[PDB]
Amino acid sequence: NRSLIVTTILEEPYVLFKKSDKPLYGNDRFEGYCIDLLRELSTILGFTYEIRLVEDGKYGAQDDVNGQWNGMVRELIDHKADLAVAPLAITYVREKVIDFSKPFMTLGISILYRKGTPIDSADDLAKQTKIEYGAVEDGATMTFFKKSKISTYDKMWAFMSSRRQSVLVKSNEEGIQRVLTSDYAFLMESTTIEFVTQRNCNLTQIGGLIDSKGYGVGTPMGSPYRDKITIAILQLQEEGKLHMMKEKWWR
Amino acid sequence: NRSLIVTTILEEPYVLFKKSDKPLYGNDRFEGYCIDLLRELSTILGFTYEIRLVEDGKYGAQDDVNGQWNGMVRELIDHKADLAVAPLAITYVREKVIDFSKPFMTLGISILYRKGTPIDSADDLAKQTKIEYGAVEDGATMTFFKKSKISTYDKMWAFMSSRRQSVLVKSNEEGIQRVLTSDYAFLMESTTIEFVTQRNCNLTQIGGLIDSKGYGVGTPMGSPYRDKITIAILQLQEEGKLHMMKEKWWR
Ligand SMILES: C=C(C)[C@H]1CN[C@H](C(=O)O)[C@H]1CC(=O)O
Ligand SMILES: C=C(C)[C@H]1CN[C@H](C(=O)O)[C@H]1CC(=O)O
């Protein structure tokens, strides 16, 4: 049985380079929530695999003009990878081109901002133009605002869109630093906000969840592995493994 | 200036009877998140008040048959109280008969269940009948399902409605005990689930948040105190006090 090619991307605490003095080889060079998840999926389902980092460094978005997909989503579409195991959001637009297992983690979009201000919700940001705000460019969060029919979010999209190169960033880290060094609020996924605020007492989540979504394993559309991965994830859930992995990497 | 009559209700860790070795009088007989909140509200705004427990022990729902409102919402409507300070959900139906300050806490509906099973979402419950499920009768959670146009939730409402006396309960504690002793899942507010699961390792939240809402201070509609309470809440927010109050009472 040839080994599966599993595409992923660096993102703390899901995927990180394992540190050591002694040389690390193959899949052992990686660690994190998604790495532990993947290992369990392989032993539960009985497959071997090789971890690779998505070449273009993206999750998956469709080009507005040429309509082509990029990121891990595109690698799956083109059968360049068998599975994608990362904090990949399960979204309607993505489900149209690839398949997803049931979620291994639930979350929602929220706001990351500095403490000490009266800003208390998305509405507060939307009704003003002084404090700038944004999201990772073309990520699931930004796309949510772009496709939203809700006036408040539509207004926010118009804002970010008009100042695209100034307010949209390339990573969660860039967004975090931007919040820390300027009057800026960052729209990001709650599970990452959770990790960040526990490590920086100057940061806080603002308001509650803007939506409800989850992360799932991606497979090429029609892959016989999608349903099998779901079975493995459900077993991990009932065995309390998913909860243990969350506590392990978030602590 | 006459003292304001503040209505509230017993609910850990928001409102509890303070335990003492010496007799306690007036407002000193109560403690909890909402009691600390109310105290800060009074000093920021300069009013005196008397805490009272809602006479009928209800939060506020409208009777399906005769259309009469009950609970704290009704006491405000009839001007029997000036303010309602409790874990009272800000909802569309309630906003029609009373006014709410901006929320002092955000949360969402979710599922409380025992650990060790493959049950992973509302859909899992909705598509079966073996495992019974419900919520506090006529509370904000039950009303959400009753008014929902989402197929999944509408199906769940049909279930609860048809087994009303068997699956709907009178309190959170009742739903909790029910989850611990029988094959039952309880739909409850996330902030309470958080308190409960931290104190009972046998319990766990299932899935993500089903909706997004918040708790707010209630006032008779048109009351001049509503905007003043909001000013106080936003101040507590920016000063980090709402966060400390949450930490204090949730541990
Ligand atoms: C880290 C990044 C750029 C990812 C992770 N989940 C989202 C995705 O699956 O696109 C992105 C974050 C976001 O959009 O807030
Ligand atoms: C404790 C109770 C019955 C309250 C608290 N918030 C909700 C309300 O404001 O109705 C209810 C819980 C729920 O409906 O799940």
Side-chain angles (χ1 to χ4, degrees), chain B residues 11 59 87-89 94 136 139-142 172 187-189 215:
Chain B
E11 183 67 26
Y59 282 70
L88 181 65
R94 284 174 180 162
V136 175
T141 299
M142 187 217 79
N172 276 318
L187 286 290
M188 59 175 270
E189 301 176 321
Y215 291 148

Coordinates of all heavy atoms in Angstrom, one line a residue, chain B residues 11 59 87-89 94 136 139-142 172 187-189 215, ligand 2:
Chain B
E11 N -29.5 31.6 40.9 CA -28.9 30.9 39.8 C -27.3 31.0 40.0 O -26.7 32.0 39.8 CB -29.3 31.4 38.5 CG -28.6 30.6 37.3 CD -29.2 29.2 37.2 OE1 -30.3 29.0 37.6 OE2 -28.5 28.3 36.6
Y59 N -38.0 33.8 34.4 CA -37.2 34.8 33.8 C -38.2 35.7 32.9 O -38.2 36.9 33.1 CB -36.1 34.2 32.9 CG -34.9 33.8 33.7 CD1 -35.0 32.6 34.5 CD2 -33.7 34.5 33.7 CE1 -33.9 32.3 35.3 CE2 -32.6 34.1 34.4 CZ -32.7 33.0 35.3 OH -31.6 32.6 36.0
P87 N -29.0 36.5 34.9 CA -28.5 35.9 33.6 C -29.7 35.9 32.6 O -30.2 34.8 32.2 CB -28.0 34.5 34.0 CG -28.9 34.2 35.1 CD -28.9 35.5 35.9
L88 N -30.3 37.1 32.3 CA -31.4 37.2 31.5 C -31.0 37.5 30.0 O -30.4 38.5 29.7 CB -32.3 38.4 32.0 CG -33.6 38.8 31.2 CD1 -34.6 37.6 31.4 CD2 -34.1 40.0 31.8
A89 N -31.3 36.5 29.2 CA -31.0 36.5 27.8 C -31.7 37.7 27.0 O -32.9 37.9 27.2 CB -31.3 35.2 27.1
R94 N -38.4 39.3 23.8 CA -38.4 40.1 25.1 C -38.2 41.6 24.8 O -38.8 42.4 25.4 CB -37.3 39.6 26.0 CG -37.7 38.3 26.7 CD -36.5 37.7 27.5 NE -36.8 36.5 28.1 CZ -36.0 35.6 28.6 NH1 -34.7 35.8 28.5 NH2 -36.4 34.5 29.2
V136 N -34.9 24.1 29.6 CA -35.7 24.6 30.7 C -37.0 25.0 30.0 O -36.9 25.8 29.0 CB -35.1 25.8 31.4 CG1 -36.0 26.3 32.4 CG2 -33.8 25.3 32.1
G139 N -37.9 28.8 28.7 CA -36.7 29.6 28.8 C -36.3 30.1 27.5 O -36.9 29.8 26.5
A140 N -35.2 31.0 27.4 CA -34.8 31.5 26.2 C -34.3 30.4 25.2 O -34.5 30.5 24.0 CB -33.6 32.5 26.4
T141 N -33.7 29.3 25.7 CA -33.3 28.3 24.9 C -34.4 27.5 24.2 O -34.5 27.4 23.0 CB -32.4 27.2 25.6 OG1 -31.2 27.9 26.2 CG2 -31.9 26.1 24.7
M142 N -35.4 27.1 25.0 CA -36.6 26.4 24.4 C -37.3 27.3 23.4 O -37.7 26.9 22.3 CB -37.6 26.0 25.5 CG -38.7 25.2 24.9 SD -40.3 25.5 25.7 CE -40.8 27.0 24.8
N172 N -31.9 24.4 35.5 CA -30.7 23.9 34.9 C -30.3 22.7 35.7 O -29.9 21.7 35.1 CB -29.6 25.0 35.0 CG -29.6 25.9 33.9 OD1 -29.8 25.6 32.7 ND2 -29.3 27.2 34.2
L187 N -30.1 21.0 26.4 CA -29.8 22.2 25.7 C -29.7 23.3 26.7 O -30.7 23.6 27.4 CB -30.9 22.5 24.6 CG -30.9 21.6 23.4 CD1 -29.7 21.9 22.5 CD2 -30.9 20.1 23.7
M188 N -28.5 23.9 26.9 CA -28.4 25.0 27.9 C -27.4 26.0 27.4 O -26.7 25.8 26.4 CB -28.0 24.4 29.2 CG -26.7 23.6 29.3 SD -26.3 23.1 31.0 CE -25.4 24.4 31.5
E189 N -27.3 27.1 28.1 CA -26.4 28.2 27.8 C -25.0 27.9 28.1 O -24.7 27.4 29.2 CB -27.0 29.5 28.4 CG -28.4 29.8 27.9 CD -29.0 31.0 28.6 OE1 -28.8 31.2 29.8 OE2 -29.8 31.7 27.8
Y215 N -26.3 38.4 27.9 CA -27.1 38.7 29.0 C -27.1 40.2 29.2 O -26.0 40.8 29.0 CB -26.5 38.1 30.3 CG -26.6 36.6 30.4 CD1 -25.6 35.8 31.0 CD2 -27.7 35.9 29.8 CE1 -25.7 34.5 31.1 CE2 -27.8 34.5 29.9 CZ -26.8 33.8 30.6 OH -26.8 32.4 30.7
Ligands
LIG2 C1 -31.6 29.7 34.2 C2 -32.6 29.9 33.3 C3 -33.9 29.2 33.3 C4 -32.3 31.0 32.3 C5 -31.0 31.8 32.3 N1 -30.9 32.4 30.8 C6 -32.1 31.9 30.1 C7 -33.2 33.0 30.0 O1 -32.9 34.2 30.1 O2 -34.4 32.5 29.7 C8 -32.5 30.6 30.8 C9 -31.6 29.3 30.5 C10 -32.1 28.7 29.2 O3 -33.1 29.1 28.6 O4 -31.3 27.8 28.7

